[PDB]
Ligand binder design. Structure first.
Ligand SMILES: [Co+2]
Length: 9
């Protein structure tokens, strides 16, 4: 999740 969100943002 941490990096999924990092990509998204
Ligand atoms: Co990252």
């Amino acid at each position: 999740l941490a990096e999924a969100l990092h990509q998204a943002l």
